[PDB]
Amino acid sequence: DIKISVVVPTYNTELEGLKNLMASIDKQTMNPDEYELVFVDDGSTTDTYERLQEFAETRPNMTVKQIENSGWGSRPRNIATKMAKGEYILYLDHDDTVFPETFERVYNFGKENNLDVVSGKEVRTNGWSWGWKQFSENNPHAEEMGIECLLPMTPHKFYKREFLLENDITFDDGARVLWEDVYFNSKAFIHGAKVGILADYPTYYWIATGANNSSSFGRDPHEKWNQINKLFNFFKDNIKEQRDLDFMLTHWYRSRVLGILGQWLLKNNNERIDIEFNYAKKLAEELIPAYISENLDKNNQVKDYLLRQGDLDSLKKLAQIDAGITALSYVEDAYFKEDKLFFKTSTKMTYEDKEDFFIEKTADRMERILPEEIKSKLPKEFFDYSDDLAEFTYEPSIKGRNSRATWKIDGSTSNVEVVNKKANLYKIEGEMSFSVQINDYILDAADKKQPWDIATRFTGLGYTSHRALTIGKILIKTALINNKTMIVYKNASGLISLDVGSSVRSIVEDSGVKREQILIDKTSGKVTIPLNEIHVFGESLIEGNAELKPVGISDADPINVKAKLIGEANKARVEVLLGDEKLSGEYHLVTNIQGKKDKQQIKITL
Template identity: 35%
Template sequence: MPRVKVSVIVPVYNTGKYVDECAPSLLGQSLPADEYEVIYVDDGSTDDTLSRLEKIAADAPNVQVHTQPNSGWPGAPRNLGMKHAKGEYIQFVDHDDTLGPEALERLYEHAKRNDADVVLGKMSSTMVRPRRLFRHTVDACTIENDELTQSMSPHKMFRRAFVEEHGLRFPEGPWILEDLAFVSAAYLKAERISILADYPVYYWMKRDDGGNNTQHRFNPKHGFWPNTRTIVRQIKDGTPASDDIDALQNRLLHRLYHVEILSRTREPEILCEDPAEQRQRFEAAREVAREEFPAAVREGLPAVSRLRAELLEAGDFDGAVTLAERIREVKPRSQVSDLRWADGRLVADVTLDLLRGDGEPLVLVERDGKQYLDPELLDGVPGTEDGWEVPDPFRLAYAELVVKDRDREDWWYPEGDLEVRLKPLGDGRSQVIATGQLALDPERLAGGQPLERGVHDVWAYVQLLGVDRMVRVTGADSTNTPASTPASTGGRLALPYWTIKGQLALDIDQRQRKLGPDTTTAATANSERSEGSSLPLPYVAAAPDATPVRVKVTVATLTVTAELLPTPDAPTAQLRLPARLKLPSGRHPVTLPKTAGPLAYAVVRDGTVLRLEGPAYEAGSGRRLLDSVGDNRQVRRVRRKLGL
């Protein structure tokens, strides 16, 4: 009997229909069913969840169901699941999430190949922004790679022997942040951690009823602040203390400080919650910040975050609200230029920056050899009357381009990096910007594989001066129009366009956009003529090794399948019609669906396509005369003798 490679542990409570939605992704894995098991642990559900689980188990030999009295949180069910697990590795899944079809097989192979204690699989989510942690697959790293703290959910694969050796368990009962406690302990103990970034293994999607939205999990009654202290101390116990702001301990604590502490002082929370309740949160956060976090953590924050921390620890709630109101108005801006196809990739120059609420650039001002944060932004913020110094404008600053598969919620990272730099504006003013090149390869972007058919939107993420934003990559006042020429790529058409909101998008294989009127405007400039059934189309890009793309065209009234092929020694495509068409002799317009003007003209004689001509091509009068009487038998005999 094959050994169990993976045990999938799923805690459930009053899950209802979501059990049935999750189950197919667990039972339909590419890993053979006798090589993995699914362990459901029902935490005392009061609805029909248990009966749904028993029905699933009755039809699947590798599914087992366990029950326990309600504990009020996922920790105890997960621990019980681990007690029953027989797999070499353990994978935690929540009852309302799904796995990619090859998730377990790929994760297990990656774990075994690298002898990993923990494997982080690429997550696709509508709950959180994409994480740069999943930009590249990593064979092995340790907690020294502090980017690991971008992913603190338990939805990972853990070697069972490693978990047992170190006695790793989830806190039980209503213990908020139980996932952070377990995962941070695992990171600290692990000798080898692997990251699988070239395949989306876990889909963490927002439920229709909002029941899995993490923003609702903050509840001081469940021990949020004591639990935060516990996790901080766990990290401090597992790493050496240091006054260096870039020491490992301070880098790891940065995530907790920024996410769990400063969230109580910033927008949107401080501007949306009941002021009385938010003041209580503010004071509790202040107490934990002052008592648990080393000064080096605060000193290592970027400019705006460091100012938030200053207001928090000074107990200035009103000042924090004023700053939050100012920062809420800061908007990101993207600028795209020189958009084009090159070597089968869609490339463009991209610049990203931040604007104040009044639309002016967010700037730094130099005074006495030092840089200070934009005084217009800080007007009225206590403690900044003499300016707020920015010792390092590039502290924790970065920017990246990401491409979202609109149908599947997958995020991919195109080639190249964006550089963060200072742009001089004159009069001692400068601006922190990010610049670089978009290089989107439709045939390799999806983890080295071609993008799926569908629409793929281009986004950017910026974190500058402690202000982080997602921004659509947009054109200059362009909406719902082509962004560049179509391209023949991988046997499909790739159509770049600006969406209604002006965002750059790429439609692969004509999912929504068609090769039609708005993508063939350049055709009228085609004054070429080609003998035979093909004609160069300079408005369609194609790499030299491109696979032919099939397209439907209409020749006169006849709809036929044509091909777009690469043009030898040129980065363009050529249109090729079938060699024979059931049409009368003559010059017939070739059009695309819903296209007003002709793409080309096909000259047909006796059912044979003699040549294709561009719309602007004007044949000589002698040629047109022969064309006009081409059905005359005598003329045909003369033409054959002349080789015409």
């Protein structure tokens, strides 16, 4: 009785990625006798099928089958679903990987709460978030929130196999379609799936390669909007719950239809803009009710209005007025305190991190700044930000540079003010203070030695700016906290990074060394090297080593000796143990804690 079936459609699969896929499944904490691997090759030209069988040689739970090419992943996933015998199915693409505890955590979460779909936290290579809303907390009763509980609607979730089979839930392969994972997840919810969200552990890594697509399907504007029309018609005809239908109509109208009416207009030729604008206008009139836009922000209500009027020229004019609106955060102070790293940051809305972004106070109204030729074409309520000045968000986030996983940094406090800069003009300014407990984000053992990058997420007046936290001054601060070496620093791009476990930087080199305070107890053979500036909390002992070379003998072998990085009584030191090495004269001394050597140029005389 198999707990999990891994459905993997392959087609001309790149060999290295296929090997990484196999290693990520082999390293599951779940016992191998309790999951199943089903690979369906979709008529590959490469030796992919031969290699899939070569992989299946060593695995009594991996099944491989070859069919002729179907042009997409829908057909192989459906056949593999009919071949599977596990309780839950994971649709794993041939270029992705899975985190090592995914199978065990997901199944126990699904079995305990009797879930039909488990939406586990998904990681993507690029970006500072993915599912920032939906992956914010575990929710075993997520389907009570509505169909939103399945976003983002990738197919990389865990589905109850008998639920799919009893409701005839398959990927649309009889027709050629984009967003097949959106159809698949919506059908799952329409038939009443009990959904749970597992957000406290990264379950799936969706990897950005360089060859994600090479087909003629979807690249032209006519096929694109044919697919968009088919998706909206699918919602209006199949979603029976009014709340769920309104969510899907609002979410997809805002992102894919109104989404071409902003900066997109500045990145495309007039021939393409004219084609897509007419399609979008026609869809709004034909499929999108007027009430959908009443629950949108002021800016999206402006785009919706001008779209239905065919006033593309005003939209182009608005795209240029809006070009560059953003909110970058600067570090006001960064310091360690007890076992945490503390930050104080500040931001404001600007054009491209330069002059201030402004709104106007006219009478009792807080208005968007527009030329009077634009304001004379719009309902006056659509550029009035009065009822929106308290809807600002300002939050920190972190991202592991190895795992690519992103997390919100909890416990932060912020405050956004609408301040009168000059005359009747108002700028928007934010301040925020937060701390980082690095253990919150260390889930796999690999996470203990990793660089982390800090970012801030600012939303308001309809704009969203999620950008790396930055600092102008040189920032280098080290800490030895409960056996964790930590270095917060301005990296070479001017952004804020945090190294933990000497992944990229040397804590001895960044702390400095009191050279004139080095002690040499030659009877015990112990060389003590006090570190200069370092925040030490708790007791630490990190084993490492060091290298000695006789000065002047430039070709000499390193003399390998043991070393210890010690934190105690809020001081840090490196102790080098000479041991049985007989030494006489001056020597270069280089410490090697956690695989990172210092550049302090230490010389001792023995």
